[PDB]
């Protein structure tokens, strides 16, 4: 019941112990064996690991951290496979800056040096987990290759351990930390529908529908560039045609808009393709999440974005999906290992596409059992040209209460009240739209028509957001709450007006409305805020002219 015999990594048969990984004929451990139990499987004392140090950023790997092997134009333009070579370059020289001194007491996680790895990210050099003691030797500022010993620690026993810039860690063991903090700080994405209605917490878990392209690449791309994570770990590239080919030397000119340096300078790509061994694709999320863990341990917030559609074996949702829970449970914001109090997080965003188009079973069945956020990209919205195409009735976030306090204290004391009010308004619109479908629009009283008018302005002026516009591609939190306050105040005035005999027609054509429709293009938040007063005075003129 073999896989493919002589391609890549493989899930090993055994004797009394079920799963281990190969590469070649030499096998690495998961369950500690007791060597040669069969057909020349010689074994070793090593887990499927990952190397973690200066070299990771800008790299592309397969699912077990093999560097990518290019290979020209087969499927359409490019086809790639993992070549067995060092994960981190042995020949490159890094600038090491010491951060401890001979005599310092250290623990796993303590930062003992810095390395500027790219123009964007200072890599932090940490004592590996489970090593502690006195620093007895540390390297001076200078340039070193990854294999150079940059420090030595004497453990309380007297044992001397040699520390390098990199470290190794088994991908299947969660990296330890002090404590996992409850969701509390939003991952600010700059996208209004998400930040306002379906927030993601730093350290939370979110799903978005697999890949069609109902603007999916667009919002997935907005999330990658704008979320306030310093580092992105991206798993995908497969899903073929020529995704792999547009991932190669298109990704090298994508800009990180926060610096205008290339985005690959805080990114690490793990590639899953049709031709890669099935067991390297299975392994890829553990490889990815371990790398993500390793940057949180430095105190970075990291966004792990995954996206594949993964095949089947010969040994399906039984004890599995409990193992996918595994993967998801390693998302979180933590107090890291170290002597200093320090916090980092890994937030997880996974694309999820069905047994084949139908949101019925395997993955879709209930990945939704574990994720706390679902942004339901919706082809009907894409056809109604409402972008991004996030359905505001079927999407949900379980983080609204967890994050409201950060919003209240830092941004606007009324964030959650406004959010709830706008949602109640969208919900009412939806009910009214159903009714009008049966009986038609002609008998709608003024009040109901006013609610449809204000809901349409919410949809158009707030939910819709233009990712291609130089201003509206990102919406800072302060801008979000000010736009919301403009809309809600217009709502208040609209029902007040109507409550006084002003016809709805006169409100529909108030001149401020056109200004409200363009506010998302205005970069000066104080100008947007000024629409509150301008709406008040206009309505006032209508209380004067008594409404006609």
Curated annotation (Swiss-Prot):
Highest taxon in the source lineage: Archaea
Transmembrane segments: none
Bilayer disposition of the protein: Peripheral membrane protein
Gene3D superfamilies associated with the record: 2.40.30.20, 2.40.50.100, Bovine Mitochondrial F1-atpase, Atp Synthase Beta Chain, Chain D, domain 3, Hedgehog/Intein (Hint) domain, Homing endonucleases, P-loop containing nucleotide triphosphate hydrolases
Main location: membrane
Matching Pfam families: ATP-synt_ab (PF00006), ATP-synt_ab_N (PF02874), ATP-synt_ab_Xtn (PF16886), ATP-synt_VA_C (PF22919), Intein_splicing (PF14890)
Family: Belongs to the ATPase alpha/beta chains family.
HAMAP family with a match to the protein in the record: ATP_synth_A_arch
Subunit structure of this chain's protein: Has multiple subunits with at least A(3), B(3), C, D, E, F, H, I and proteolipid K(x).
Name of this protein: A-type ATP synthase subunit A
Organism: Pyrococcus horikoshii (strain ATCC 700860 / DSM 12428 / JCM 9974 / NBRC 100139 / OT-3)
UniProt gene name: atpA
